[PDB]
RNA sequence: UUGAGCCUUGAUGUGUAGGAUAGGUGGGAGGCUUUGAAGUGUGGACGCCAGUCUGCAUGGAGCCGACCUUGAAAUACCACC
């Protein structure tokens, strides 16, 4: 009647407490979703349950025999292996019961002794409940269920496929507890549609953190906050939580102002004149001392991080022109005889299926890799701002301050360079935590930091390979307004629907066989023309 | 039909004794069949833990009325003398699947306690039902006569169903009614002797004697 | 008072630990220092803990 | 007429191959069925829609296990289930 329990937990890095006195309850066959603002600690909870770190003052009590494996939020760095190799390393704990049974037949290759006869009990002690016999006919099984081929070097797959491999390596062990940190990041609609049935049928229990407001509704039995060191649950469908949470925020805003009201009028009284022979009760001076001390508390609004772009001089009227360009990877064609133009102030959305060449198409435009034929001509006064799929432009060890604005002070903001390191306060970075290595930051925090230093330099051009992977809707809402009003050219890549109906006016819908169909309008308008296509018989 | 007649003929909700059921259970035997007995004992264990899972080895004189011709696997000549002494085939270790190309595994386990010529098929296909001989149930022993004596002694394996119920053949109803009581006493203490460490409350939850197509009675 | 106290439990099995401080918001890595273990009287590797 | 446990009586169980929505362990070979089918439609129900479940009367005694082409095979008692 309970699966994982956590009572009186505490986690506090050299900072304000990530986890206060908090509690959790995991039942049989439930899909629980964690919903918290960026940098709030959803991933660190996943590392606590997965038996990975921390929990200084608290007790975790989960039953033995409970196999737990999780899916991380950031793509791995052991990328230089192969797909079957990377997926295999998810059975590391199972690799010991597997290997002893074949090993300790050598002791029984000799005469049967107590040390050799009693062994078969030990290695097969775990074997009764698990399968453990086919950890090669299951790893190759899941791919036929998923689609990956096992012997393709994994340092090659796309962002969507690389994410798929990390969802398999966390599922080879067949865990009773599935912890999915950001499952739908670089997937297409087909993969997301299929995954919504894989997880529903899944026999065990699922805990997942998703920023998809449409994935959560289809699969969320219960929902959990983890707001500011305390986590509280909620009943009902997903839209209920938004309503109940807003009341929690409004009331807490209402009581927060009232406390300041008392403390405001208790500081006019401390410096008032005494009068004639009176004492100024210290039952009120000490209470004011306790009120001033209590102001070292949590700031209920995280702060709606504010941003602004750095417009530069207008680019040439032609940004990209490529005709007769036809680039094809060894097996299949990614782009076959392209012919298109990108003009000034044209906002283009690249959409399509997984691994269809969206990321490599941008690489052709910037000349990262050479076209097989056809030639590409680039604009003449371009100031490119580049947002890769995998960030890859921040070393995880360099400090937060140095990665932002390339290890220099004196950011340029708005008009003239009269700003330094205050550019963090616009992004709700506390100025104390400015020497933190970038690897320590959360996924969404790292997304914004790379976003911050692109809007930090003059630019006539934006290339965004899924810029809104980890951002929450409150921060994503600003990005929709910023990119919309941007005067220069914008080519953005995204796998969600609502976001491209407010920023883009054209689409380059990908098709098989290296064919790209260019439609007009937002996402929904372009898909509308694609039903009514007649393809010029 | 007969199920509608027989459903009144038994009162399985009730409780009975070790002997007031032998005639009570044979009344359903009107049907012409081999009557493959499916005795059922409900066990009390936290079945979905690992440590309490138990698997048993037994010997019974009455047999089951249908012996098993199970090959023996040993690297080299582990089947060159035991094949004629209690095996349908002598499965050579160097040709582990050779004697059983179609049926990679025999009916019974392979007794090569001194021979480690193969873990067995390398792919778990030789463990489809748990045929790998282990010292927990004493299936591994270099003495072929131990497995060879299985045919002359009727070796029967136990099963730990995912709810924790052991099923075994009894020596189908064809035989007498006192031999059933002898059979139960054999499986009673020898399974009490087979009880694992952890337990709670009672150990043997319920007892019943039944068949694939035969009604049952709560023995107790 | 940013720094937080920690202890280095020995890998040599013998229950033993040195204690120290660590700036946890600028040092995500976990210390691993070689120091004396008087129970086993050898220099072993001490890894971080609570 | 309402909320928890039992005791049965009824139905639920789709990764795919495939006969098709296919629960563990059964242990089997042949049962059922004629108190009368394959069917005819009926009615609430079911869909993850390819169906599988039973009233209702006309007709009502023919279908299955069998070879496996699978991780595990046959709606073919009952065992806390
Ligand atoms: N090893 C660490 N050392 C110090 N501080 C850390 C460490 N790991 C995380 N933090 C900080 O503590 C908080 C926990 O970050 P975490 O990755 O858990 O956030 P999150 O809620 O998962 O974020 P996101 O919504 O962006 O995915 C963040 O503010 C982060 O900067
Ligand atoms: N370094 C590489 N070596 C070999 N093949 C590669 C390499 N990078 C990409 N590919 C292949 O090129 C194709 C397109 O990859 P790309 O990164 O452009 O995908 P994408 O269209 O952006 O898709 P997604 O949305 O899944 O990231 C895929 O078949 C991918 O496997
Ligand atoms: Na990509
Ligand atoms: Na995170």
Q: Which of A267, A316, A69, A292 lies closest to A181, judged by CA?
A: A69
Give, in degrees to the nearest 5, the angle at Cα B10 between B8 and B12.
125
Task: State how far the alpha carbon of C4 is from the alpha carbons of A15, A535, C21, in Å.
Answer: 9, 68, 5
Q: Look at residues B134, B112, B151 and name the one whose alpha carbon lies nearest to residue B54.
A: B134
B142 at interface of A, judged by CB pairs closer than 8 A: yes
Where are the strands (E) in A210-365, listed by range? 222-224, 233-234, 318-328, 333-343, 347-351
Chain C residue closest in CA terms to A11: C50
Which nucleotide's C1' sits nearest to the alpha carbon of B4?
D35
Nucleotides of D strand lying within 7 Å of any protein CB atom: 7-10, 15, 24-35, 48, 68, 71-73, 76-81
- Please tell me if residue A247 touches chain C, with a CB cutoff of 8 Å: no
Q: Which domain holds residue C44?
A: 1-50
Chain centroid offset of residue B102 CA: 24
Query: Is the C-beta of residue B1 closer than 7 Å to nucleic acid chain D?
Result: yes
Cβ within 8 Å of residue A2, ≥6 positions away = A25, A26, A27
Q: Could you give the CA distance from residue A219 to residue A175 in angstroms, rounded to a whole number?
A: 19
Q: Could you tell me the two tokens for B205?
A: 């939850």
Contact B93, B112 (CB under 8 A): yes
Residues 105-144 of B with CB under 7 A from strand D: 125, 128-129
Cross-strand pairs, B58? B156
From A437, which residue of chain C is nearest by alpha-carbon distance? C26
Distance from CA of B214 to the nearest CA of A (A): 30
DSSP A219: S
All residues at 6 or more sequence positions from A250 whose CB lies less than 8 Å from its CB, including other chains? none
- Based on the number of CB atoms within 10 Å of its own CB, is A525 exposed (0-12), middle (13-18) or buried (19 or more)? middle
Check CB contact of C3 with chain A, cutoff 8 Å: yes
Tokens 């709670």 locate to B200
Between A139-146 and A159-169, two packed helices, what is the crossing angle to 10 degrees?
A: 140
- Mutation for testing the A interface, residue in C3, C26, C31 having most A CBs under 10 Å: C26
Which experimental method was this entry solved with? Answer: cryo-EM
CA distances to A83, A93, A116, A143, B122 from A98, rounded to whole Å, are 21, 9, 17, 21, 12
Task: Please give the C-alpha separations between residue B197 and each of A66, A187, B52, B53, C29, in angstroms, as whole numbers.
Answer: 20, 49, 7, 10, 44
Q: Which two tokens stand for residue B144?
A: 């072929």
3-state per-residue secondary structure call for B112-123: CCCCCCCCCCCC
Residue A96: other Cβ atoms inside 10 A: 12
Say how far apart CA A148 and CA A171 lie, in whole Å.
Answer: 14
- Distance, CA of B136 to CA of B139 (rounded, Å): 8
Can you tell me whether residue B53 is helix, strand or coil?
A: coil
**Phi, psi values for residue A33, rounded to 5°:** -110, 140
Please say whether the beta carbons of B57 and B138 come within 8 A: yes
Measured CA distances, C16 to A54, C31, C41 (Å) = 20, 16, 12
Domain count, chain C: 1
Token digits of residue A189? 């609609």
- Give yes or no for B119 touching A (CB within 8 A): yes
Ligand 1 centroid to Cα of residue A45, in Å, is 10
Radius of gyration of chain C measured on its C-alpha atoms: 12
Q: What is the CATH number of the domain that holds C32?
A: 2.20.28.120
Task: Please state whether beta strands A177-181 and A205-209 pair in parallel, antiparallel, or not at all (unpaired).
Answer: parallel
Q: Measured in angstroms, what separates residue A90's CA from nucleotide D25's C1'?
A: 31
Q: Is C5 on the interface with A (CB under 8 A)?
A: no
In sequence order, which residues have a C-beta less than 8 Å from that of residue A445 and are 6 or more positions away? A38, A39
| Given resolution (angstroms) | 3.1
**Cβ atoms of B118 and B93 closer than 8 Å:** yes
Q: Do residues B93 and B77 make contact, with C-beta atoms less than 8 angstroms apart?
A: no
Residues of chain C in contact with residue A14, where contact means CB-CB under 8 angstroms, are: 2-4, 22-26
Residue A365 sits at φ, ψ, to 5 deg, of -65, -45
Reported for A115-124, long-range contacts at CB under 8 A and 24+ positions apart, including other chains, are A117/B135, A117/B140, A118/B135, A119/B135, A120/B134, A120/B135, A120/B136, A120/B140, A121/B134, A121/B135, A121/B136, A123/A97, A124/B132, A124/B134, A124/B136
- Most A CBs within 10 Å, among B112, B115, B126, B134, to test the A interface: B134
Q: Do C25 and A56 touch (CB under 8 A)?
A: no
Q: Using the CA of A201, which nucleotide's C1' is the nearest one?
A: D15
| CB contact set of A273 (below 8 Å; sequence gap of 6+) | none
Span between the terminal Cα atoms of chain B, in Å: 29
Q: CB count, 10 Å around CB of A158? A: 18
Dihedral of the alpha carbons of A495, A499, A504, A507, in degrees to the nearest 10: 20
Which spans in chain B are helix H? 2-9, 22-26, 144-153, 178-192
């Amino acid at each position: 009647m309970s699966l994982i329990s956590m009572h009186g937990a505490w986690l506090s890095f050299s900072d304000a407490p990530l986890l206060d006195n908090a509690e959790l309850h995991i039942e049989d066959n439930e899909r629980v979703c964690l919903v918290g603002r960026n940098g709030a600690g959803k991933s660190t909870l996943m590392k606590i349950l997965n038996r990975e770190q921390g929990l200084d003052d608290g007790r975790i009590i989960y039953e033995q025999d409970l196999i737990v494996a999780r899916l991380q939020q950031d793509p791995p760095r052991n990328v230089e292996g192969s797909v079957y190799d990377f997926v295999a390393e998810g059975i590391e704990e199972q690799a010991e019961y597997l290997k002893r049974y074949h090993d300790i037949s050598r002791l029984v290759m000799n005469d049967p002794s107590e040390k050799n006869l009693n062994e078969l009990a030990k290695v097969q002690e775990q074997l009764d409940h698990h399968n453990l016999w086919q950890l090669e006919n299951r790893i190759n099984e899941v791919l036929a269920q998923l689609g990956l081929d096992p012997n393709v070097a994994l340092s090659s797959l796309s962002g969507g496929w690389l994410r798929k491999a990390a969802l398999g390596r966390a599922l080879v062990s067949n865990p009773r507890v599935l912890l999915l940190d950001q499952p739908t990041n670089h997937l297409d609609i087909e993969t997301i549609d299929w995954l919504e049935g894989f997880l529903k049928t899944f026999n065990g229990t699922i805990i997942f953190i998703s920023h998809d407001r449409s994935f959560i509704r289809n699969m969320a039995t219960r929902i959990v906050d983890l707001d500011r060191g305390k986590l509280v649950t909620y009943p009902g469908n997903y839209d209920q939580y938004l309503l109940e949470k807003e009341e929690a925020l409004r009331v807490e805003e209402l009581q927060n102002a009232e406390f300041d009201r008392k403390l405001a009028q208790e500081e006019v009284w401390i410096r008032q004149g005494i009068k004639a022979r009176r004492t100024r009760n210290e039952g009120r001076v000490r209470a004011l001392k306790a009120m001033r001390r209590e102001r070292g508390e949590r700031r209920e609004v995280m702060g709606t991080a504010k941003m602004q772009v750095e417009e530069a001089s207008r680019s040439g009227k032609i940004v990209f022109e490529m005709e007769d360009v036809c680039y094809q990877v060894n097996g299949k064609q990614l782009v076959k005889d392209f012919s298109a133009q990108v003009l000034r102030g044209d906002k283009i959305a690249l959409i399509g299926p997984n691994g269809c060449g969206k990321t490599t198409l941008l690489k052709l435009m910037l000349g990262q890799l050479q076209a097989d034929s056809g030639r590409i001509h680039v604009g003449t006064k371009l100031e490119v701002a580049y947002f890769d799929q995998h960030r890859a432009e921040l070393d995880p060890d360099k400090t937060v301050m140095d990665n932002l604005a390339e290890g220099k002070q004196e950011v340029m903001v708005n008009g003239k360079p009269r700003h330094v390191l205050g550019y963090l306060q616009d992004f709700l970075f506390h100025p104390k935590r400015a020497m933190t290595p970038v690897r320590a930051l959360s996924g969404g925090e790292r997304n914004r930091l790379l976003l911050a230093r692109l809007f930090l330099k003059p630019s006539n051009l934006l290339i965004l390979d899924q810029p809104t992977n980890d951002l929450d809707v409150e921060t994503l809402e600003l990005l929709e307004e910023l990119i919309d009003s941007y005067q220069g050219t914008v080519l953005l890549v995204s796998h969600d629907r609502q976001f491209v109906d407010n920023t883009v006016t054209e689409c380059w819908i990908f098709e098989g066989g290296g064919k790209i169909g260019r439609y007009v309008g937002g996402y929904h308008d372009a898909r509308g023309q694609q039903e009514q296509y007649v393809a010029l018989k | 039909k007969r199920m509608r007649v027989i459903r009144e003929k038994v009162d399985a909700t009730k409780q009975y004794d070790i002997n007031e059921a032998i005639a009570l259970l044979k009344e359903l035997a009107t049907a012409k069949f081999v009557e493959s007995v499916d005795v059922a004992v409900n066990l009390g264990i936290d079945a979905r833990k690992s440590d309490q899972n138990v698997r048993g080895a037994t010997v019974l004189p009455h047999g089951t009325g249908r012996s098993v011709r199970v090959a023996v696997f040993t690297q080299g000549a582990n089947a060159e003398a035991a094949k004629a002494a209690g095996a349908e085939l002598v499965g050579m270790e160097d040709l582990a699947d050779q004697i059983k190309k179609g049926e990679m595994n025999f009916d019974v386990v392979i007794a090569s306690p001194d021979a480690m010529r193969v873990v067995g098929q390398l792919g778990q296909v030789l463990g489809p039902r748990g045929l790998m001989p282990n010292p927990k149930v004493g299936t591994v022993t270099p003495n072929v006569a131990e497995a060879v004596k299985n045919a002359k002694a009727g070796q029967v394996r136990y099963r730990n169903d995912k709810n924790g119920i052991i099923h075994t053949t009894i020596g189908k109803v064809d035989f007498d009614a006192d031999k059933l009581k002898e059979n139960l006493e054999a499986l009673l203490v020898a399974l009490k002797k087979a009880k694992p460490t952890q337990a709670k409350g009672v150990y043997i939850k319920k007892v019943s004697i039944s068949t694939t197509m035969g009604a049952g009675v709560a023995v107790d | 008072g940013i720094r937080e106290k920690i202890k280095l439990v020995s890998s040599a099995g013998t229950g033993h630990f040195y204690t120290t401080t660590k700036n946890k918001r600028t040092k995500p890595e976990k210390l691993e220092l070689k120091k004396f273990d008087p129970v086993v009287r050898q220099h072993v590797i001490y890894k971080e803990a609570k």
